[PDB]
Every structure is written in C-alpha cells, then in structure tokens.
Amino acid sequence: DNPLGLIDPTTISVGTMGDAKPYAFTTADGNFTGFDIELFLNVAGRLGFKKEQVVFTGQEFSALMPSVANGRFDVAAAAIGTTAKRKETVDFSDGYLAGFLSVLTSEAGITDAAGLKGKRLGVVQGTLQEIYAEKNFAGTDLVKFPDNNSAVSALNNGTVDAHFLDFEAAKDYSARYPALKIAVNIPSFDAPAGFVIRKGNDALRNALDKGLKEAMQDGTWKKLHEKWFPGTPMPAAYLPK
Numbered sequence: 001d002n003p004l005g006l007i008d009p010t011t012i013s014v015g016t017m018g019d020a021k022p023y024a025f026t027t028a029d030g031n032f033t034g035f036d037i038e039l040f041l042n043v044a045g046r047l048g049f050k051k052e053q054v055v056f057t058g059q060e061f062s063a064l065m066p067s068v069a070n071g072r073f074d075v076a077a078a079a080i081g082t083t084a085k086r087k088e089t090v091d092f093s094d095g096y097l098a099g100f101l102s103v104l105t106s107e108a109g110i111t112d113a114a115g116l117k118g119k120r121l122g123v124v125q126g127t128l129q130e131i132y133a134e135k136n137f138a139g140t141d142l143v144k145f146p147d148n149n150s151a152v153s154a155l156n157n158g159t160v161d162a163h164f165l166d167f168e169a170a171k172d173y174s175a176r177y178p179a180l181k182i183a184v185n186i187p188s189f190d191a192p193a194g195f196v197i198r199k200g201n202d203a204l205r206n207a208l209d210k211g212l213k214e215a216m217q218d219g220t221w222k223k224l225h226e227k228w229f230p231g232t233p234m235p236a237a238y239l240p241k
C-alpha cells in the first residue's frame with residue numbers, strides 16, 4: 001500500500017535547490033547535499049527509506065511550494081521559512097532551524113539598514129527576504145533574481161549594491177568572494193525552516209515530525225548543525241532534552 005501518500009510508494013521525491021549552500025546545494029558531481037538535505041535523509045531513514053530511495057530535484061525557490069501543492073514532489077526541503085501565508089498553500093513539518101536574514105554587500109558597501117535607502121538590493125523571487133524588504137525597506141530599489149548565484153554575480157559586477165539572502169548562504173558567499181561582507185542581520189525566528197508537504201498529507205507530516213524530534217533528541221541534529229554551520233549558536237529547543 002501507500003500509508004505516506006507518496007507519488008510512488010517506494011520512493012520519496014524531494015524538491016530542493018542547487019544554490020542555497022550550506023542549507024541545500026549541489027556538489028561538483030551534481031549530488032544534493034547540505035544541512036537540510038542531510039537532515040531530511042536522516043529523517044527519511046527513520047521513516048524506512050534508504051538514501052537510494054530519496055530523489056532530489058533542483059528548482060528555483062519560487063517553484064518549490066507550487067510544485068508540492070501541484071503534486072510534482074512529495075516534500076520540499078530548502079530552508080523554507082514557516083509562515084501563515086505559506087500555510088495557506090502547503091503544510092509544514094515542525095521547525096528545524098531558526099536564524100537571520102542577511103544583507104550581503106561589497107567591501108566598501110552599506111554599513112546598516114539605513115544605508116539601504118535609495119540603493120539597489122537584490123532578492124530571490126518568492127523568498128521571505130522579498131516580503132521583508134517590501135515591508136521594512138521602503139525606498140530601496142528591489143532587484144528580483146531567479147536565484148542566489150545570479151544575484152551574487154550582479155553584486156560582484158556592481159549591478160546591485162547588496163543582496164538579501166539567508167545568513168548561512170551570505171556567510172558562505174563571503175567566504176567564496178572575500179571582498180563580500182554581511183552588513184545587516186534581520187531576525188527570522190518567527191519563520192523557522194520546515195519541510196513542506198502537500199495540504200493536508202497528515203501521515204507524511206506526522207512521520208516527518210517524529211523523525212525530526214528523534215534526530216534532535218539523539219544529537220543527530222546537533223552533529224549536522226556543527227558540520228554545516230560552524231560557529232552558529234544552537235538553541236536548547238533543537239538539542240537533546
């Protein structure tokens with residue numbers, strides 16, 4: 001049978017993204033990796049699904065939740081912030097990561113949120129960054145990008161003054177392009193990352209939640225967090241109790 005309500009009962013089809021390093025990304029061989037991928041794989045194993053039974057498809061961020069809602073994938077995993085607005089379209093698992101939205105700029109760029117008034121700020125279409133900047137960065141010219149790589153290329157070229165993306169990805173790009181630096185950190189603890197599932201696949205949602213709680217309780221979450229986000233604080237909520 002099919003208790004988890006999957007497209008194929010023998011395989012879990014996961015929608016993800018290739019350029020949200022270190023949450024979710026492709027290595028040079030094309031394989032999907034990163035914290036969110038390794039955490040999902042660990043949770044999927046607890047559900048009785050081996051690595052070979054989980055298939056990852058890379059999509060632009062804006063395509064992920066409509067793809068799950070339209071039955072193209074069973075799950076979506078790509079640091080997808082849990083919000084009321086997104087809960088109208090899709091269901092979410094319990095939160096597994098809460099952190100900052102970050103403004104990445106050039107070596108002689110912006111210093112604070114005030115510095116963004118009248119500047120060109122890059123954003124990935126469909127992200128929480130795009131909503132935040134529309135509500136809190138009025139006067140900043142928002143330049144929409146399909147993904148992080150194109151936005152960083154524009155930032156490196158001087159097309160845009162800054163780029164608004166997730167903290168760990170901003171941190172990763174500042175390591176890959178040493179001239180880049182994080183100028184502003186905005187709290188996004190009210191929107192923790194959750195695995196996205198079809199409205200309302202209660203079986204898969206409850207199964208994902210159980211696997212997540214287990215991975216946090218046995219220190220698996222802690223181990224992956226230490227591996228992918230070195231130096232980032234881990235709250236007691238996601239650590240063993």
Ligand SMILES: NC(=O)CC[C@H](NC[C@H](O)[C@@H](O)[C@H](O)[C@H](O)CO)C(=O)O
Nearest residue numbers: 079080081098099100127128188191193
């Ligand atoms: N580009 C992406 O993959 C996702 C970007 C963006 N992530 C927001 C995060 O989920 C943020 O709210 C979290 O608190 C945390 O820092 C990482 O999941 C979003 O959901 O739109």
Ligand SMILES: [Ca+2]
Nearest residue numbers: 143144145146
């Ligand atoms: Ca553009």
